[PDB]
Amino acid sequence: LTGTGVLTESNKKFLPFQQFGRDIADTTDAVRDPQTLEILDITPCSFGG
Amino acid sequence: SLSSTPSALGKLQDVVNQNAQALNTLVKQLSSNFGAISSVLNDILSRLCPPEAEVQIDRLITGRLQSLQTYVTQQLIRAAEIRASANLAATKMSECV
Amino acid sequence: VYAWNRKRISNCVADYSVLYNSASFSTFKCYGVCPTKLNDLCFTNVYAD
Amino acid sequence: QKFNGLNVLPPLLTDEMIAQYTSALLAGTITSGWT
Numbered sequence: 001l002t003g004t005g006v007l008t009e010s011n012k013k014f015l016p017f018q019q020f021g022r023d024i025a026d027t028t029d030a031v032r033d034p035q036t037l038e039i040l041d042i043t044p045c046s047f048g049g
Numbered sequence: 050s051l052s053s054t055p056s057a058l059g060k061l062q063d064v065v066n067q068n069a070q071a072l073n074t075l076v077k078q079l080s081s082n083f084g085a086i087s088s089v090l091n092d093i094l095s096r097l098c099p100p101e102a103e104v105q106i107d108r109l110i111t112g113r114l115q116s117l118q119t120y121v122t123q124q125l126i127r128a129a130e131i132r133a134s135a136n137l138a139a140t141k142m143s144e145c146v
Numbered sequence: 147v148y149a150w151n152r153k154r155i156s157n158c159v160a161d162y163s164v165l166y167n168s169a170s171f172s173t174f175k176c177y178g179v180c181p182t183k184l185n186d187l188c189f190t191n192v193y194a195d
Numbered sequence: 196q197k198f199n200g201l202n203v204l205p206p207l208l209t210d211e212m213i214a215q216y217t218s219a220l221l222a223g224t225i226t227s228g229w230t
Contacts, residue, residue: 096179
């Protein structure tokens with residue numbers, strides 16, 4: 001699951017069977033780390049006009 | 050009269066709701082495949098080689114470009130209606146107030 | 147062929163370049179995936195018929 | 196929605212500025228009519 005963005009500790013209360021979350025844009029906004037099994041939030045890096 | 054009727058100001062709420070719906074539609078269209086193997090561009094690039102990936106990508110570009118063009122056209126039409134309303138309000142200010 | 151075998155591959159690391167770059171094969175036709183990119187992918191299971 | 200390239204721009208006039216214009220119109224009408 002490749003991509004670019006800022007990773008932080010998540011406050012999302014994932015259940016044991018859930019590996020990631022999705023938005024309405026069909027993008028991943030949270031993942032479970034395969035080694036530590038902690039949940040990370042994913043956000044885009046800053047941009048603007 | 051106003052406080053006892055939650056829908057009294059519907060004329061302004063309708064404008065807010067229409068704008069919100071237009072944006073939500075524009076975003077949701079990103080989930081469409083448009084004939085591509087996937088709506089997710091990164092998955093296409095990660096799985097397929099260039100001469101094949103480009104074929105799938107062009108399908109997403111066509112669909113997304115068409116969706117964005119549709120959005121703008123609708124905004125131009127809606128803007129014209131709002132301008133007419135503002136022109137009327139400006140006239141009433143001058144002549145009634 | 148009327149009684150083809152199947153084996154399941156799991157819980158392991160697959161270096162697909164050992165097969166892809168082999169001259170022992172007359173054909174190596176992939177569908178839905180580019181063979182040169184297999185080393186960057188993860189799967190739940192791989193089945194060998 | 197910003198993450199999809201969609202941005203919302205602020206008005207030039209703030210709500211406070213609009214309220215101030217309205218107050219001036221009311222004060223004008225009450226003290227000097229249409230003059």
